[PDB]
Design an enzyme around this catalytic site. Structure first.
Site, PDB file in Angstrom:
ATOM      1  N   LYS A   1       1.754  35.129  49.826  1.00 10.42           N
ATOM      2  CA  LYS A   1       1.992  35.770  48.528  1.00 10.42           C
ATOM      3  C   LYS A   1       2.603  34.848  47.440  1.00 10.42           C
ATOM      4  CE  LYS A   1       5.063  39.326  48.323  1.00 10.42           C
ATOM      5  NZ  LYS A   1       5.240  40.604  49.072  1.00 10.42           N
TER       6      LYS A   1
ATOM      7  N   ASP B   1       5.640  39.347  32.905  1.00 10.80           N
ATOM      8  CA  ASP B   1       4.327  39.961  33.066  1.00 10.80           C
ATOM      9  C   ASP B   1       4.470  41.354  33.665  1.00 10.80           C
ATOM     10  OD1 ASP B   1       4.714  38.947  35.831  1.00 10.80           O
ATOM     11  OD2 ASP B   1       3.872  37.037  35.089  1.00 10.80           O
TER      12      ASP B   1
ATOM     13  N   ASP C   1       2.913  46.105  35.919  1.00  6.20           N
ATOM     14  CA  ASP C   1       2.857  44.645  36.070  1.00  6.20           C
ATOM     15  C   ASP C   1       1.463  44.103  36.261  1.00  6.20           C
ATOM     16  OD1 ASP C   1       5.591  45.445  36.502  1.00  6.20           O
ATOM     17  OD2 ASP C   1       5.511  44.917  38.642  1.00  6.20           O
TER      18      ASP C   1
END
Lengths: 989, 989
Positions: B771, B910, B702
Site C-alpha cells: 500500500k 487529497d 479522498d
DNA sequence: ATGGGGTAACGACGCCAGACG
RNA sequence: GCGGCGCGC
DNA sequence: CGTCTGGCGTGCGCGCCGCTACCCCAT
RNA sequence: GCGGCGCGC
C-alpha cells in the site's frame, strides 16, 4: 602531502609512545581505518608509531594486526615497520623461522638490513632488541666500524683544533668538590623549574593591612589549587572520552606531566600574570613551552638520565677545576664528547596547532577554575579571577587575558616579598653544558635552541643538522667559551644602586623613580561653570601625566627584576650560557641580568676569577676608566693615561665617598662603570704590590663603526680604512665627528641659500645628534628610521626650538646620508652589489642563503603569507646580515685563539672584553684574526657560491643569465694593505 | 558585491534607526570612513541609513556631514539620499531656496522627483514630511491617481472574483460582541508571547518530596532572574564599548527588546530545555527568532499599531459574525483590504550571520549566568546549570547544550503542573488575520511566512513579491478560508483518551504507555565467575530495553503536549491558520494539535459550527463510519450504508459503553474516528428529528492514489483512469489490491523457477504490505526507500520468518515497481519526459522554475555548496513537485468554489472534508474543478513556458537546441474523456 | 546509597566526478 | 546536525 | 575524447527523545 | 598582536 589534522593525529600516536597508552592509540587508529573518509587521513608513519609502541610491549598479536591495516590501506611496509617487528621478535624471543621470513620479506621489498640501523631513529634499548633477533638468523652480522671523531680542517679553524701547537687553556679558581656542589644546586633548581628571589622593593606598608591581605590570598590559593586539580582530571576525562569515539583530543599530551606539576605551573602563571593583562596567544605559547620543558625534565628524572648526567658532568669538571688534571689537553666540548657519549636521545617538538591548542586548553582551564569573591572584605558572590578583553586599536582585534582589579589590589596589599622566575630565565649556578650539537648544550636538563630566530625556524633548524657535523665546531666552541666565563656581582655597586632604588631613585644615573615621584596634575579638575577649552586643557595635561607615570612604571618594574636577581646572586659565582641568531651573532640566554645591558647592569658585574695586573694592568685600568668617562675620546692612549694621573684625587674620592664626596664619577658618559673602575683603581694603587693585585674588572676594546670597518676591509678602501681606524694613526679617527662637521658645512651653505631649517639648526649639529644614525645606517637604518633617532636627540636639547623638531630631523637625516655616501663611496659600491644580487635572487622566488668563512650556513627567513620570499626585506636585509655574519666570524676567531693563550674572553658583538692583565694579547689576536678573515677572497667566494646555488636551474636560463651577470660583477678592490690593521692602535680601542 | 562584514554593518546602521541611537550609529560610520582600509567596507546604503536617521530627528547639520562623507568616499547620492534631505527640510521647515537647490541638484544627477515616491521605502510620517518640503517649491505637485484595486482575471479564478453570480458566503455561529472578546483574548496571549497550559500527566508523587523540590526551584529561579538581568546589562556595556572603538557589535540588537522581556524569554527557554540536550545551533536560531518576534510585537505595542489593529479587526468581524451584515458581499481578504488599508510597514529580517551571533550571544549569556549547587539537599559549591557536550557520531562533531543531571532530577521531583508554549505554536482563539500578501496574514502581531520552505527561502520569498499582486489571490484566499474554519474539541473522546493516558496507556489504540510499562531486563546482571558470552548476551538484551524505553518516552512526550493543549482548548472555539510549502501544498501553522495528524488527533476535533443533516446527512454519517472501519473498502456506497444498518447495535453499544461494552469500534482501521462517528450517529438517530440534527462531525472524501489520478488526467490514459477511479464504475477500483495480486502472480512464477525468497513469501503478499509503496512511488519513492517501507510491514507479521526480512523486502520492492511500470505505461512516459527535461535544465546550471495554473510561481531550491543546482534532486524532484502543485491547485479551486456555495471546507491534501449535510455539493465541486483544471493543455503550457524561460540564452545555442528538442517532445494524450470524472462516484470517496 | 568519576577499545544501485587510457 | 522512532499523504 | 571506479544518497510534511556504556569507588 | 617607552650595537 602534510595536513593540519594529519600533523595532530601523527603527534597523538607519537605521544602515546611517551605515555605507553597503546590501547588508546590503537583504538583511534582502528576507528580511523574502519571509516571510509577517515582511513585516507592515516599515513604509514602513524601506523608505524602504534606498531613500534606494541613492539616495545612485546605485543606481537597487536603489531601483526597493525601490519594487516597497513597492507589493507593499502600501503607498503618500510624500514621502521621491519625494525618494529624485529624488536618485538627479539623482545619476545621468537623462533629463527619467523625472523628469517621477516628478513627475506624485507629483501623482496628491496629494503636493506644495514640501511635500517642508519635511517631508523632508535633508542639504545630499541637498537639492542632488534640486534638480538638478527643475531639468531645472521649471527655474523656486524655494524659499521666506529667511532673515530673528526676534527674541523677549515682554513681559519685548522689551527684551533690541530694538536700541533702549545695550548694553555684556562681553568677556574674553584676546586672540583666545590663545582660538584654548584652542579647539584643548579640541578635542584632545574628540577623545580622555578627560582624564588626576594624582591628589592619596599617595605613601606602597615602590618594590619598586609596580614589580612596575606591571609585572604593564602585561603584563595588553597581554593584554586583544589579547583585546578579537579578541573585537570575533569578535562582529562572529557578528552579521554573523545578518543573512545573516533576523535583526536589532547588527552595523551596532558598525560605527559604529573598533575601536581601542571597545577604548580598554572598557579605560578596566575601569580605572575601582569595586571594590565597578557595576549591570550602569548600566554598559550608560554603555557605550552612550560609544559613541554617540565615533561622533558620529568622524562629524564624517571629514566636515569639525571643520574647519568651527574656521573658525566662530575667527570667533565676535571678539565675546569683548579685541583684537577685531564689526560691530554682539549676543549670543553671535546672532553664532554670523549667521556660519554651515547648523546642520549632527541625529542622532536610538537606541531604548532598542538602547541597552540594545548596552551589555550590550559589557559581556559585556569580562567574557568579560578573563582574569587568580588565583595573583598559575608563575601557571597564568586566571580572569575581572570577575564577576556579585546584591544580594538590594532584594526585586527586581539584577545587579552586580564586579572580582576580586586585580585590586583589584593596582591598589592599582600606585598609578597618574593618574585618567581623560570630556571632557564636566570643565570646558571654551575658552568653550562658544552654545545655538542644544535639540540644539546647550555642548561642541564631543560632544552635550548642553538638558534634563537623563531621566524623561519624550521628552515634554519634543519640546515644546522643538514651540514657536516664538523662544520658547526667553531661556532659551538665559541658559544661554549662565552658560556664558560665565571661572573660575580660587584657588591659595592649593588648597595649604592639599591640605596637609590629603595628611596626616590635617581633617573639622572639611570635608576628608576618609584610611583611616588610620578608627575601630578596641578590641580585636579575645578568645574563646571567655566570653561569648555580649559576643561580640554586639563584633559591633555592629565593624558601626559598618565603617559609619564606608565613609562616610569615600566622602567621601575624592569629594574626591580634585574636588581632582585643581582641581590639573589650577590654571594654566588654564576655563568651565562649563550645562543646565536640566524646571522651567527651571539647573545646570552638569561635575559634579565647580563653584560649586554645598560651602564647600571654592566657595572654590577665583574669576572669571578681575577688575574694579577702585571706590568701594564694598572695603566689599562686607567685607560679604561678614562674611556668610560668619554672625556678624552679624541686623545691618544698615552694622554688618556696622563689624564687619569691628573684626576687621580677625584678617582679616589669617587671610589671612597660615591654619594657624599665630590661625585666626579657622576659626570661620566658611563657613570656606574666609571665608579666601578674607580673602586678597582683605588684597590690596585692601595694594594701592597699593585702589579700583583688580583684584578676582576673586565677592560673593553671596541671597534669604531665595525660595520664600515668590515666594508673598508672587503673593498680594500684606503679612504674608508683611514676613517674607521684600519690604517694606523697615532690619534683615533672619529667618523661621528667627521659626519657632524660635514653636515654643519652643508647647513651653513643651505642657511645662506635661504633655507629656514638650516638657519634654526645653527650651533646644534653635534656628534651626539648624528652618532646613532652614522653607526646603524650600515646595519640597514633608512631615512625614516634615522629621522626618528635624530628626533630623540633634538627633543632632549631644551635650547632647540621644539616647533622645528620634525623639519630639522628630516633635514639632518638627508644630510647625514649625503655625508656617508661621499665619505664611503667604496662601501656604497659593495652595498649596491649585495642589494642588487639579493633583489634578483628573491625575484626568482628563492630566499638568500650563504655560508660564513667558519662554515655556518645562513638563511634569510623573510617570506610572506608555500610562502613566497619577501623581496623587500630580502634585498634590504642581505647587506647588514652579510656584514653581521662577518663580524660574528671575527668575534668567534678572536675568542677561540684567545682561549689557547689562556685568556677570559667575552664580547658585546664588536666590543671585546678581558682582564686588564691581558689587553695587549687580546688586541694582537683581534687584529691577527681580522687580517686572517679578510685576507680570504670573501666577496669572490660568496659570488662563486651564489652562482652555484642559484644559477643551476635548467628552465628558465634567461633570469639566471641576468643573475650570473650581476653576481660576477664583483666590485674591484682598492689600494689599502690589510696587513696594516696589525699595527693600528685604534682599530679596537 | 555583498560581504559577511558588510551585511553586519548595514544591519547595525538599520538597527540604530529602530533604537534611535543615531550618535552611536554616526560614530561607527565616522570611525570607518576615517580609516583607509575600513572606508572601502562602507556602502551608499549604510551612509543613507544614518542620513535617514538624522533626517527623522531634524538634525540637518549631521545629515549634511554624512552627505560630505558620501561625496568624499567618493560615491554619488541616490533617491534615498535626496528623500532623507527633503524629510529633514520639511520637518525643520527650511526655506524654499534650500529646497529648490536640492530639487535641482537632483535633476543634474538625472534623478526624477516622481521616481522617489515609487522606488523609496518610506513610512506615512517619512512620506508626509518630504511632501511638505516639495509643496513649498512645487505647490502643484500631485502623486499618481490611486487606489483602484484589481481583480484576478485567470482562466480558472475568473468566476471566483467576478461580481456576476449568486454568492452565499458562510458566516460563523458566534455573535459580533463574542468574537471581539475572543480577539481580545488572542491579542493578550500574543502580547505575552507565551501560553501556560496545565499538564495532563500525573499526579503520583509524595508531597514532602514535591514541596521541598518546588521551594529549591523557586529560590534558584529568583537567583537566575537577578543573574540574567545583571549579565544582560554587563553584555550591553561590553558591546557598547566595542562601538566606541571602531568595531561592529550586536549592541543595538540587544536594545530592540525590553530587558525584562529578554530575561523572561531566556528563563522560558531554560525551563523547557530538553534533558537530553539541544543542538547549540538550533537553540541559537530559536533564541534569535524569539527575540525578533517579541521586538516586532513591542514595536506595534508602542507605536499605536495594536490599537489600529483592534479598530480594523473589530470592523472586519461584521463579515464573519452571525448578528452582523456588510454593505456588499465579498471574501475575508477583500473586506480586510476595503476597511483600511495603509498595509502598515514591513520589516526586513536580519542577515543569517547576525541571526546566529545574537542567538549564540544569548545562549552563552544564559550558560554563563545560571549557577546552582551540585550538593542538592550546606549546599556550598556552585556549578553551571547548562554545559556543552559533543556528539562524535556525525563524523563532523556537533555541539549540544545539555542541562546538569541534578537540575533535571530537581524539575522531575518538583512535578510542575504547567507546560509553556510560544503563542504562534498554539491554535488561535479568534479567526486569523486574512492573508493579504506574503508578509501579512495568520497571527495578529507575530510575523508568519507565507512559504514554509527554509532552504532557498531568499529565491522563493522574492519571487512571491516579484509576480503581479493579483497572481497570488487564489492561494491567499484558499489559505484564508482554511484558517477561517472554526474548530472545537470532542469532549467525550478526550475524556476516554485521558482515562487511558493517565493510567497505563493503550498502545493498541495509539495511546502511549508511561515509563512504568517499559520492558525490564529479566534479570539484572548476576556475575562474575560465569560467563563471557552470557555477559554480552545480557548487554544486547539491556541495549534493546533501553532502545524501547527511549522510543516509548518519545511517543509519551509527544502525546503529552497534544493532549495538554486539547484539555486547554476543551471549552473553547479555536482556529488553525495555514501556510504553504514551495510546491503550493498547504499545512496548518500550529503543529502540536491539528487535523493533519493521527487517528487519536483527528478524533479529538470537530467543526465548532454544526449543520443540520438534511435528507442525506445521516446516510453520509453511516457511509463515513463504515469508511473509517476499513471493512467494506471494495464495496459500493449502498452496501456500506447497508452494512451500517446491520451493525447498528454495535455502533450504539460502542458509543454508549466505549471501554465497558462489546468494544466493536476498537477493531476498526481508524478506531478513535470510528468511535467519534458512532457517538455522532447515536446522537443523530436519538434526536427528535434526525434530518434537523445539527451535526459537527467532518465527513471525508479522498482521492485514491491522487498522484496517479493527476497523471491519468494529464496523459488522458484510459487504462490508468480506470485503475484510479477517473472512469465511472459502480464499484471502487483499488490499485493497492491490483498491485498485491500481480506481485503474488510474479512470486508464484519465481517460486517455481527455484527462487528461495519467492518460496518463503507464499501467503504474505497483501494490500497492507504494498500500500504505502504503491501510494508514494508517484511522489518520488525509490527502490531503497520502498524496501524500508516494506521491511516495516514484514517485521510486524510474526508468522513471517524474520531471517528473510531483507531479501523479501528487496524482492518485493522490485516486484512492486515492475507491476506499477506495467499498470501505468502511459504515466511512465510523462514521468520520463519531466525527469529528462529537468536533468537538462539543471545540467545548464539553472534550477527548474514553473507557474501553477492558478498563478503561483514554483522554484526548486535544490542547490549544492553562487551555489550550483543539485542536478540529482532537481531531476528526481521535478515530477513529484510538479504533480503536487497540480493537486494543490485542485484543492484550492475546490475550496474557493465550495465557499461560494456556503460550505465549510478543510483538506489533508487529497482528502476533502465538509459537514455530512454537504457531501454531495463538495463532490460536485471537486469533480467539476478537477475537469476544469485538467481541461487546459497543462503539459503544452508547461512546455511552452520552459522553452521561453530556459531556451533564450544567446550563447550557447547547442545545449538549448538539445533542450528545445526534449521540451517539445510532449507525450501524446490517450483516448479517455476527462468529462467522465463528473459522473465517477469513487474518484473521491 | 547513589551520583558521578574513571575508563573501556551481511546485503542495492543510479548518478556524476575525477582518474585513467 | 546526525540518529532512533512515530504519524500523515 | 571514451571507458573504469568509487563515494554519495536514496520521499517529504509534521512530532518527540537521544547525543556511549556502566562498574564501583567515593562521599 | 599592536602601541608606549627604555637599553645595546
Amino acid at each position: 602531502q602534510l595536513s593540519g589534522q594529519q600533523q595532530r593525529l601523527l603527534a597523538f600516536f607519537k605521544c602515546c609512545l611517551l605515555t605507553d597508552q597503546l590501547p588508546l592509540a590503537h583504538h583511534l587508529l582502528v576507528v580511523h581505518h574502519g571509516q571510509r573518509q577517515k582511513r585516507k587521513l592515516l599515513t604509514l608513519d602513524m601506523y608505524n608509531a602504534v606498531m613500534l609502541g606494541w613492539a616495545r610491549q612485546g605485543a606481537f598479536k597487536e603489531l601483526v594486526y597493525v601490519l594487516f591495516m597497513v597492507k589493507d590501506a593499502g600501503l607498503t611496509p618500510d624500514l621502521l615497520s621491519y625494525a618494529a617487528a624485529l624488536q618485538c621478535m627479539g623482545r619476545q624471543d621468537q623462533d629463527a623461522g619467523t625472523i628469517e621470513r621477516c628478513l627475506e620479506q624485507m629483501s623482496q621489498e628491496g629494503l636493506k638490513l644495514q640501511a635500517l640501523f642508519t635511517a631508523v631513529l632508535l633508542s639504545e634499548e630499541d637498537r639492542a632488541t632488534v640486534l638480538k633477533a638478527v643475531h639468531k638468523v645472521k649471527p655474523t652480522f656486524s655494524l659499521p666500524p666506529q667511532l673515530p671523531p673528526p676534527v674541523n680542517t677549515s682554513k681559519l679553524l685548522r689551527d684551533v683544533y690541530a694538536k700541533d701547537g702549545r695550548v694553555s687553556y684556562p681553568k677556574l679558581h674553584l676546586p672540583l668538590k666545590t663545582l660538584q656542589c654548584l652542579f647539584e644546586k643548579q640541578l635542584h633548581m632545574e628540577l623545580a623549574s622555578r627560582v624564588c628571589v626576594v624582591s628589592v622593593e619596599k617595605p613601606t606598608l602597615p602590618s594590619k593591612e598586609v596580614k589580612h591581605a596575606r591571609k585572604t590570598l593564602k585561603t584563595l590559593r588553597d581554593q584554586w589549587e583544589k579547583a585546578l586539580c579537579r578541573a585537570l582530571r575533569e578535562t582529562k576525562n572529557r578528552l579521554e572520552r573523545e578518543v573512545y569515539e573516533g576523535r583526536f583530543s589532547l588527552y595523551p599530551f596532558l598525560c605527559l606531566l604529573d598533575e601536581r606539576e601542571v597545577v604548580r605551573m598554572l598557579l605560578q602563571v596566575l601569580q605572575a600574570l601582569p595586571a594590565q593583562g597578557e595576549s591570550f596567544t602569548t600566554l598559550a605559547r608560554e603555557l605550552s613551552a612550560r609544559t613541554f620543558s617540565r615533561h622533558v625534565v620529568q622524562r629524564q628524572r624517571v629514566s636515569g638520565q639525571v643520574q647519568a648526567l651527574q656521573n658525566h658532568y662530575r667527570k667533565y669538571l676535571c678539565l675546569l677545576a683548579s685541583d684537577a688534571e685531564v689526560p691530554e689537553p682539549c676543549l670543553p666540548r671535546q672532553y664532554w664528547e670523549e667521556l660519554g657519549a651515547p648523546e642520549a636521545l632527541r625529542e622532536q617538538p610538537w606541531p604548532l596547532p598542538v602547541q597552540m591548542e594545548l596552551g589555550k586548553l590550559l589557559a581556559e582551564m585556569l580562567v574557568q577554575a579560578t573563582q574569587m569573591p568580588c565583595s573583598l572584605d559575608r563575601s557571597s558572590r564568586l566571580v572569575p579571577v581572570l577575564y577576556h578583553v579585546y584591544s580594538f586599536r590594532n584594526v585586527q582585534q586581539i584577545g587579552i587575558l586580564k586579572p580582576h582589579p580586586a585580585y590586583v589590589q589584593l596582591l598589592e596589599k599582600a606585598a609578597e616579598p618574593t618574585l618567581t622566575f623560570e630556571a632557564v630565565d636566570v643565570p646558571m649556578l654551575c658552568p653550562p653544558l658544552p654545545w655538542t650539537s644544535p639540540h644539546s648544550g647550555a642548561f642541564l636538563l631543560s632544552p635550548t635552541k642553538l638558534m634563537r630566530t623563531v621566524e623561519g625556524a624550521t628552515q634554519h633548524q634543519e640546515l644546522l643538522e643538514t651540514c657536516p657535523p664538523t662544520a658547526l665546531h667553531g661556532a659551538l666552541d665559541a658559544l661554549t667559551q662565552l658560556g664558560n666565563c665565571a661572573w660575580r656581582v660587584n657588591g659595592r655597586v649593588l648597595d649604592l644602586v639599591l640605596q637609590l632604588f629603595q628611596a626616590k631613585g635617581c633617573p639622572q644615573l639611570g635608576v628608576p623613580a618609584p610611583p611616588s615621584e610620578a608627575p601630578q596634575p596641578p590641580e585636579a579638575h575645578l568645574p563646571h561653570s567655566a570653561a569648555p577649552a580649559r576643561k580640554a586643557e586639563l584633559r591633555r595635561e592629565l593624558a601626559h601625566c598618565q603617559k609619564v607615570a606608565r613609562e616610569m612604571h615600566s622602567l621601575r618594574a624592569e629594574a626591580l627584576y634585574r636588581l632582585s636577581l643581582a641581590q639573589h646572586l650577590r654571594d654566588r659565582v654564576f655563568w651565562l650560557p649563550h645562543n646565536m641568531d640566524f646571522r651567527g651573532r651571539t647573545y646570552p640566554c638569561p635575559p634579565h641580568f647580563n653584560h649586554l645591558g645598560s651602564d647600571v647592569a654592566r657595572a654590577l658585574l665583574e669576572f669571578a676569577q681575577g688575574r694579577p695586573l702585571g706590568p701594564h694592568g694598572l695603566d689599562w685600568l686607567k685607560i679604561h676608566l678614562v674611556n668610560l668617562t668619554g672625556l678624552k675620546k679624541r686623545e691618544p692612549l698615552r694622554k688618556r693615561l696622563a689624564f687619569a694621573e691628573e684626576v687621580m684625587d677625584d678617582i679616589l674620592d669617587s671610589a671612597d665617598q660615591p654619594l657624599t664626596g665630590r661625585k666626579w664619577w657622576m659626570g661620566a658618559e658611563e657613570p656606574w662603570q666609571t665608579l666601578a673602575c674607580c673602586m678597582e683603581v683605588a684597590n690596585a694603587v692601595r694594594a701592597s704590590d699593585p702589579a700583583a693585585y688580583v684584578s676582576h674588572l673586565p677592560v673593553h676594546q671596541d671597534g669604531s663603526c665595525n660595520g664600515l670597518q668590515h666594508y673598508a676591509a672587503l673593498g680594500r678602501d684606503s679612504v674608508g680604512a683611514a676613517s674607521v681606524n684600519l690604517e694606523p694613526s697615532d690619534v683615533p679617527q672619529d667618523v661621528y665627528s667627521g659626519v657632524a662637521a660635514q653636515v654643519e658645512v652643508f647647513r651653513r651653505q643651505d642657511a645662506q641659500r635661504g633655507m629656514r631649517v638650516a638657519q634654526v639648526l645653527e650651533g646644534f649639529i653635534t656628534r651626539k645628534v648624528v652618532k646613532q644614525t652614522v653607526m646603524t645606517v650600515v646595519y640597514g637604518v633608512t631615512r625614516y628610521g634615522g629621522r626618528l633617532q635624530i628626533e630623540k636627540r633634538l627633543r632632549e636639547l631644551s635650547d632647540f626650538p621644539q616647533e622645528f623638531v620634525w623639519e630639522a630631523s628630516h633635514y639632518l637625516v638627508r644630510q647625514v646620508f649625503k655625508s656617508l655616501q661621499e665619505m664611503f663611496s667604496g662601501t656604497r659600491a659593495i652595498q649596491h652589489w649585495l642589494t642588487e644580487s639579493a633583489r634578483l635572487i628573491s625575484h626568482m622566488g628563492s630566499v638568500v642563503e650563504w655560508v660564513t668563512p667558519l662554515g655556518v650556513p645562513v638563511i634569510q627567513p623573510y617570506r610572506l603569507d608555500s610562502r613566497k620570499p619577501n623581496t623587500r626585506k630580502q634585498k634590504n636585509g642581505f647587506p647588514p646580515n652579510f656584514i653581521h655574519s662577518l663580524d660574528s666570524s671575527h668575534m668567534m676567531l678572536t675568542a677561540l685563539h684567545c682561549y689557547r693563550k689562556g685568556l677570559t674572553f667575552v664580547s658585546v658583538h664588536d666590543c671585546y672584553w678581558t682582564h686588564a692583565a691581558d689587553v695587549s694579547v687580546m688586541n694582537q689576536v683581534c687584529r691577527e684574526q681580522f687580517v686572517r678573515l679578510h685576507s680570504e677572497p670573501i666577496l669572490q667566494d660568496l659570488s662563486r657560491f651564489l652562482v652555484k646555488r642559484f644559477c643551476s636551474e635548467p628552465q628558465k636560463i634567461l633570469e639566471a643569465s641576468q643573475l650570473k651577470e650581476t653576481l660576477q660583477a664583483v666590485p674591484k678592490p682598492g689600494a689599502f694593505d690589510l696587513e696594516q690593521v696589525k699595527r693600528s692602535t685604534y682599530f679596537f680601542s
